[PDB]
Design goal:
Elements lengths: L5 E10 L5 E6 L5 E2 L2 E3 L6 H13 L6 E6 L4 E4 L15 E11 L16 E7 L3 H5 L5 H16 L3
Parallel strand pairs: 1-7
Antiparallel strand pairs: 1-4, 2-3, 2-8, 5-7, 6-7
The structure holds guanosine-5'-triphosphate (GTP).
Keywords: Hydrolase, Magnesium, Manganese, tRNA processing, Zinc
GO biological process, one term: NAD-cap decapping
GO molecular function, one term: RNA NAD-cap (NMN-forming) hydrolase activity
Length: 158
């Protein structure tokens, strides 16, 4: 369904009650992003979200509240140099649903090492638009729309 070259994907914005969001550092790199990942066949976006929430951040439902979610896809294109044309299903980009999670269990529960090959090796609380300012350029349009979609809810926690 909707085989359009864009891989179904779900991203996570974790917030606290001070208008900050959790920013994660890609393993062995100095680039940062929100947790994201593919939605597997048969999974709802919410189910994929909770799976990657634990795989990438070590958090489960008891640690968070889903405050909001986006209903429609936000799409971004890979840089042409990064497209893998011989690996099916070929994707030229990702189409993302996004979830807004309040962390309610405390910072110590974040655990990015639930695997021997972790996605991330560090995290920071950052100001609300800092992800828009710092994310790789080809995700910036999506990040703007995600953060704006979630802004009123995040502010309501302060
Ligand atoms: N230099 C640089 N490259 C990035 C950055 N983020 C993603 N990339 C590269 O862009 C390509 C696409 O990245 P993503 O769209 O995040 O997809 P992915 O990480 O391969 O797959 P998922 O984590 O499952 O969503 C990957 O090959 C990354 O190496 C970044 O912040 N800096």
């Amino acid at each position: 369904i909707d085989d359009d070259g864009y891989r179904p994907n779900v991203g996570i914005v974790i917030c606290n009650r001070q208008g900050q969001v959790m920013w994660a550092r890609r393993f062995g790199q100095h680039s940062w992003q929100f947790p994201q990942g593919g939605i597997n066949p048969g999974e709802s976006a919410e189910q994929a979200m909770y799976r990657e929430l634990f795989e990438e951040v070590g958090l489960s439902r008891k640690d968070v509240r889903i405050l909001a979610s986006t209903r429609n896809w936000l799409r971004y294109k890979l840089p042409k140099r990064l497209v893998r044309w011989d690996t099916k299903p070929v994707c030229i980009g990702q189409k993302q649903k996004w979830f807004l999670l309040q962390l309610v269990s405390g910072d110590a529960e974040i655990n990015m090492q639930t695997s021997s090959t972790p996605e991330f090796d560090g995290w920071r609380w950052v100001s609300y638009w800092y992800p828009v300012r710092q994310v790789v350029s080809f995700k910036r349009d999506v990040y703007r729309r995600v953060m704006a979609a979630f802004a009123s809810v995040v502010m309501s926690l302060q």
